[PDB]
Design an enzyme around this catalytic site. Structure first.
Site, PDB file in Angstrom:
ATOM      1  N   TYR B  53       0.938  -1.172  -0.146  1.00  0.00           N
ATOM      2  CA  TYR B  53       0.054   0.161   0.042  1.00  0.00           C
ATOM      3  C   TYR B  53       0.912   1.426   0.009  1.00  0.00           C
ATOM      4  O   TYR B  53       2.038   1.414   0.580  1.00  0.00           O
ATOM      5  CB  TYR B  53      -0.895   0.031   1.273  1.00  0.00           C
ATOM      6  CG  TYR B  53      -1.996  -0.743   1.270  1.00  0.00           C
ATOM      7  CD1 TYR B  53      -2.515  -1.674  -0.070  1.00  0.00           C
ATOM      8  CD2 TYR B  53      -2.850  -1.199   2.346  1.00  0.00           C
ATOM      9  CE1 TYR B  53      -3.423  -2.657   0.001  1.00  0.00           C
ATOM     10  CE2 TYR B  53      -3.918  -2.315   2.473  1.00  0.00           C
ATOM     11  CZ  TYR B  53      -4.032  -2.891   1.214  1.00  0.00           C
ATOM     12  OH  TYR B  53      -5.219  -3.822   1.184  1.00  0.00           O
ATOM     13  N   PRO B 216     -15.503  -4.640  -1.541  1.00  0.00           N
ATOM     14  CA  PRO B 216     -17.051  -4.907  -1.285  1.00  0.00           C
ATOM     15  C   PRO B 216     -17.941  -3.946  -2.229  1.00  0.00           C
ATOM     16  O   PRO B 216     -19.026  -4.312  -2.302  1.00  0.00           O
ATOM     17  CB  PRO B 216     -17.303  -4.592   0.195  1.00  0.00           C
ATOM     18  CG  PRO B 216     -16.207  -3.663   0.420  1.00  0.00           C
ATOM     19  CD  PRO B 216     -14.988  -3.830  -0.484  1.00  0.00           C
ATOM     20  N   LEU B 217     -17.284  -3.162  -3.138  1.00  0.00           N
ATOM     21  CA  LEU B 217     -18.161  -2.314  -3.923  1.00  0.00           C
ATOM     22  C   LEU B 217     -17.783  -2.647  -5.238  1.00  0.00           C
ATOM     23  O   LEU B 217     -18.638  -2.159  -6.246  1.00  0.00           O
ATOM     24  CB  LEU B 217     -17.704  -0.988  -3.685  1.00  0.00           C
ATOM     25  CG  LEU B 217     -18.592   0.049  -2.662  1.00  0.00           C
ATOM     26  CD1 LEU B 217     -19.036  -0.843  -1.336  1.00  0.00           C
ATOM     27  CD2 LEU B 217     -18.055   1.342  -2.327  1.00  0.00           C
ATOM     28  N   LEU B 221     -18.301  -0.195  -8.525  1.00  0.00           N
ATOM     29  CA  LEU B 221     -19.362  -0.121  -9.435  1.00  0.00           C
ATOM     30  C   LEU B 221     -20.694  -0.564  -8.525  1.00  0.00           C
ATOM     31  O   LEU B 221     -21.829  -0.506  -9.363  1.00  0.00           O
ATOM     32  CB  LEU B 221     -18.906  -1.696 -10.126  1.00  0.00           C
ATOM     33  CG  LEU B 221     -19.734  -1.986 -11.327  1.00  0.00           C
ATOM     34  CD1 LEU B 221     -19.460  -0.601 -12.293  1.00  0.00           C
ATOM     35  CD2 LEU B 221     -19.409  -3.157 -12.077  1.00  0.00           C
ATOM     36  N   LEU B 222     -20.545  -0.816  -7.438  1.00  0.00           N
ATOM     37  CA  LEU B 222     -21.980  -0.822  -6.561  1.00  0.00           C
ATOM     38  C   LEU B 222     -22.257   0.187  -5.552  1.00  0.00           C
ATOM     39  O   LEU B 222     -23.294   0.315  -4.940  1.00  0.00           O
ATOM     40  CB  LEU B 222     -21.858  -2.024  -5.714  1.00  0.00           C
ATOM     41  CG  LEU B 222     -21.646  -3.566  -6.186  1.00  0.00           C
ATOM     42  CD1 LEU B 222     -20.851  -4.457  -5.030  1.00  0.00           C
ATOM     43  CD2 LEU B 222     -22.821  -4.126  -6.719  1.00  0.00           C
ATOM     44  N   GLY B 224     -22.999   3.145  -6.756  1.00  0.00           N
ATOM     45  CA  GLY B 224     -23.558   4.335  -7.347  1.00  0.00           C
ATOM     46  C   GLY B 224     -23.037   4.805  -8.601  1.00  0.00           C
ATOM     47  O   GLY B 224     -23.044   6.093  -9.046  1.00  0.00           O
TER      48      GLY B 224
END
Lengths: 313, 322, 294, 297, 318, 295
Positions: B53, B216-217, B221-222, B224
């Protein structure tokens, strides 16, 4: 003073365990040093403490009072089998930060560090779990303890407030991979509460654990505590006191002497607040309770005996 | 804040796991620190980072930010379950020098001490493999971790992007000789991508691992994306077939008064065996939006509607056979 | 006939597994033997009694074949699945019907997540020690079930699974995610069940001389094999024989042409060109985690 | 009929255990229990009960094949659990049951003079000869379950799969360590004497229409019978339905000898005690919870 | 530069292992550093040495030249797989004082600390046994190595000059108690001497050890001996082996030292040879021989000039 | 007759091993005399050679009870090699040809590199526990095969291999490299097959009235040395082996009472330091690896 093996291991301990609970909260540092010196000269080499002893915001103070006792020299630390505990919340009383209680490898590592520091010593002899933690598996718990053993930071591991099957699971898991399992169980045991007889004490006997009883006067109830609320136990207590008056005996010293006859019991933990309290407890170890008194004690304080005979057959 | 044991072990972890990808890259040091302080206030005690990271020439910068954060005192170190990763090439981007990536005992020794140094702490709580390495056998890998454990440099060992059989082999291998096996798996698991259900999540559930869901998105893409159309998710919306999927998702949630971001996290919290998602807040406001997503209740109509927009394979062998 | 070690073990087998009224199976089995096929598989009892009527015709039949069969089920409690109770009755009814005192490869029909491996291996070890069984295999398992199963066995010296029988063909390649990699790590042979995807790969569009996106898959398949001179059923078998870890596919010919058809398929060697083409009609998922993440 | 796994193992049993106490009556009920879907047969609520089973099997019709058959094991070594007494016990039992294998072979009681490496030798021999599939315990301590299955697993053997203990509303002390240990080790829990010897079976209304001579016990059962008199339930069914709500309880041993007693236990399997009723039943018959909280903290 | 897994393990190494036995005795410290930077630059990370290298009164010197090479910084230590050894006497030559050679845990303990201090580093990557010691049992050996492992002082353990049954016995012993066993065997193996093929290489291959071949030119014997004439082997049996070697390679226009190295790279199970450059031209010569391709025709010739015995028992029964 | 423990185990065998002849009657007579000379160790180095011992055991007279019985396991798949399938079929066929319910020493014919040891030990453990066999041995193994086999057996508690039958004679000594050292490490008896190298050591040139280019010269020095010493070629080839560390003794296949009698004379013959020095001169050994090809 009477000696014995701590169950199956090579450790030889006094049959009285000096409880240090009051050193700090109820008895001061000076007089606590005096009480520990008295114990040493009376032959008591087995001292029990806990990180959480000190209470409230002083949780930790007892481990420091022993630390400053050792710091005077005189082969004091070399003479003592030092036991202390991990499990309790060392934060402010109440719902602990997650992993700052119970027996994760995380809380064990940070607790031992704090305890070694307060105690002014590079090693604990007997590092006991203060309670069973059902959410931490034994391969994790023994990993933590074994690391402390290999670094020479602890020697033996003990338990407190375990079920009998915890003692068995713990020591079978440790034996599988070549590790000394639990060597002692610190269980609540006295004339009024005798249900450790059902499974806890026979388990510890099967696997060779010492048995040390805490609350051996049951919170002082067995200490002659009518002498200036439920009526049933009041009566149990009154007859215990009448019975001892007919026999010329002190209620405190019988509670302790009676544990000293129970099978597999290494000894009670005595928590003296003065030296006269230590003295009084040392005489309890020379007391020989007759078969007349023992019999009539088991009449007033009936025991359950082992499981499954206790509740089935 | 909901807590849960991390799989079979004594570790209690918040069901939101603070990810730290952004700290350094997209959030500067100061704000990173402010968000971390806010997580502790919201009860999040489980922090996930990685050596790599920080990006490019600045890899390891994220760990340094948590380290300076710990250096402020205040029981910040003592309060958090600290997790980081080993596998990744910390050299300049591109083909690594031999043994400077992946899971040899050599790479593990060097990665851990540099991470510990950047984190300014004497131990990592969860040391995670970042990816499966098929060239390194498990007696080597468990040799390397076990040295770190006995020295007190690490506590717990986790995996990320493993296969089902990798989790099994790792933990049987550890068990033979009394080692604590893997305690957690970090898998790519969300609505659009549910193939971890085939074998990864069932294995971890058999062997008593926590399941930590990353991305988790699905790259946002989840969260919005199509309504914000007023990297992975960029040219994935340029699928006619796929941009109706995310359409029905945003249409459904509009009917029900629900936010696309929050429903992605809340859904993961309903999947069996999932400890919790990793949230990646770039501000305290988006942290606060994740904390609300952990308290949302997803009703049976929504989850029904979700499962038919986003079909899941379920477990092998039933997923391709019977 | 090409032969191969069944995964890691010392058992040698043909790369066609002969799968599945009475006397027309007896002749096809004898010529499968003549073809050099020793791997016989019962992949419910008449077939076992039929193989049982075969061995009782003397002449080296039980001594020449690798005999494989399965547990029953797919009910009454403990009459399906993999408890020690059903294993015991299943095997004892299987030995009865087959008319033999031992089974060579005894297989589980499917995964039973409710039965622990210490229970399963106890029941197999009782049969290994009584000479009733030699080797154990799995069928329809997940990759992590193989790992757990052979790891469990090795702790106490047992030989674990030697074979996994999965659904694997050109239309369905999802065993490449984890089933087959696990099998490869632990040295199980991989036996391809339904190699023609219920005959869908065996030239079905043409047999209409008698889903729109799935028949265009088969259309591009046959049209491809038209232009390259190749037979469709054979290529589906030959395509599995090139996949690493594949021991061979189950085939059950009943004519002499299908037996010759299948033997040709195990000799056919596909050019790299056609392998590439089949790959783009029937893409594969890759092994996990790479298949769904990186 | 509700089925469930017997603890951790893959054996599926019905939540009613068919226990014991001439052959025609026995046979008919056994045939009828099988009709009701009961598959778990046990020869205890150990002589004649076994041969009544052997002659029931002798009637054919897949009877043996459809039941999970469970049985259990003073001149020296004619009792207790030496490998000597086990070897003579099972062979006598096999002959009287008219079968070549027992599915679940149980100890009658813990034997504190016999170590577990000897017991598991004897059990494993029978296992490997095929005479025996599963092993279970009766009347153990929690710590005997752990010591047993720990010693079994050291060498790959299946441990105990079930423990048969005295468990009912009036006697709840198996909740301290017995039932906690079996859930940890994955043993089915089989509640022996689930009515406490009929004490829970409407014993006061049958006194009009032995432990009853104690007023403190007498009021306890009176509160129990009054509560179900207000709730519409039969007391003998509650006692089994209650047990079916306890974590780790596989089911109670029931000994119906008639179709009417059978439809009464089936019906018991199907009741749903309301949270109101459970709450009241727990104030009437309190449990001790698990050790060490039961007696320390 | 080709890389390979060291046997069954996760460690990636170069198929050329850098021999350092010349660094100090013949090649000087400043020029040994330059050869080692060029080996880094050419992709070699597998550096091999020994506590003894230096010879006579100067045993230990080679290890010191790597230490001062590591002390130059520049990620030299972090890029290199460091391999050293233990067995040889480090004191005055000749009969060793008891336990100052061989593989007792006592000698192991004293040899690793003295090698650590010379090498200027807190860990060795590959600690090798220089030879079999039939007198030390494996519970003794794996105890001492495990202590080094768990202290973080060594990563991997390897052997050198073992029989096949020593490898088996050690790796089976280590596995009983979870320990990673031998990861590499360093045997003597070249065109003239192929008897490691009988048991050493098969066992090594069975147990997943890398095979590193030392003396790959057979002391120079395969290094263009007679053409350079402008050990002894003035025996006419070996000079026909070697004449037909050099004249075949001159029929085909090849370097003798390069083929000896390119040959070992084609043998199954061989990780690669140890190349011992004295100059940086000799280093580049070895790098070349590693992207050499020997035709399937030449390999036939070498095999009928340097016949192998193959695996036992076939090598002497059937 | 000199006896010895078979390697590390309690089985006591004669230092001579009665090997396979080739008549039922004539084989029976050799075997009955072998018993009378104290030779108790019988091996079958399979068809008729096993049924002849079987007709022998059926005569009774405690012949099976006195004898330690040893035997062994293109081809149809799994009808050679050491797959669990082939072991169970070989031992069934052997037990019935032999007219006996147990073999004392069941031996592998040759290493099989394609069968794992947990497969092999599975098969052998089945037979042990059914009383069908007692002891396992090997033939034609490499040293690391012995090591690997017995390490695998010991993990889960089995007796490993108890003996290796290797090609070991004056002419071929490359078993001193690794196979004999491994067998010595793991406590196996070492059974010498072909002790005369196909007859090359029992007087090949003094009976001329296979092998003769380079090898003839050394066979002459052999026969000449033994003339000048008054020793017999065959008896010495056998007696040399009996001095070799770890060697239990050699397989002898006497087809005449005389030959058996000669073999026995070989077992109590004592070779002198000078003969031993001279034979090593004529027939050098390589010594153990790695010293043999390195240092």
């Amino acid at each position: 003073m009477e000696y014995t093996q701590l169950g199956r291991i090579g450790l030889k301990v006094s049959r009285l365990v000096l409880g240090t609970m009051n050193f700090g909260p109820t008895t001061d540092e000076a007089e606590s040093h005096a009480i520990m010196d008295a114990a040493l000269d009376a032959g008591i080499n087995f001292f029990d403490t806990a990180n959480v002893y000190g209470w409230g915001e002083n949780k930790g103070r007892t481990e420091e009072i022993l630390g400053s006792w050792f710091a005077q020299g005189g082969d004091r630390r070399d003479k003592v089998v030092l036991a202390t505990k991990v499990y309790g919340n060392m934060g402010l009383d109440g719902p602990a930060w997650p992993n700052h209680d119970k027996l994760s490898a995380l809380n064990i590592r940070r607790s031992v560090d704090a305890s070694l520091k307060r105690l002014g010593t590079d090693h604990i002899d007997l590092y006991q779990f203060h309670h069973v933690d059902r959410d931490t598996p034994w391969d994790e718990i023994w990993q933590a303890m074994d690391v402390l053993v290999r670094q020479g930071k602890i020697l033996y591991v003990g338990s407190s407030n375990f079920a009998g099957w915890n003692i068995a699971q713990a020591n079978e898991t440790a034996a599988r991979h070549g590790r000394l399992g639990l060597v002692s169980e610190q269980c609540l045991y006295n004339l009024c509460e005798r249900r450790a007889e059902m499974e806890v004490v026979p388990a510890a006997r099967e696997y060779g654990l010492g048995v040390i009883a805490w609350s051996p006067l049951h919170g002082g109830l067995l200490g002659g505590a009518i002498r200036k609320k439920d009526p049933q136990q009041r009566e149990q207590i009154q007859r215990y006191e009448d019975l001892l008056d007919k026999h010329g005996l002190e209620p405190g010293e019988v509670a302790l002497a009676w544990l000293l006859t129970r099978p597999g019991v290494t000894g009670p933990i005595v928590g003296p607040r003065t030296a006269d309290q230590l003295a009084s407890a040392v005489r309890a170890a020379e007391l020989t309770l007759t078969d007349e008194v023992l019999t009539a004690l088991d009449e007033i304080f009936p025991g359950p005996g082992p499981s499954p005979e206790a509740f089935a057959w």
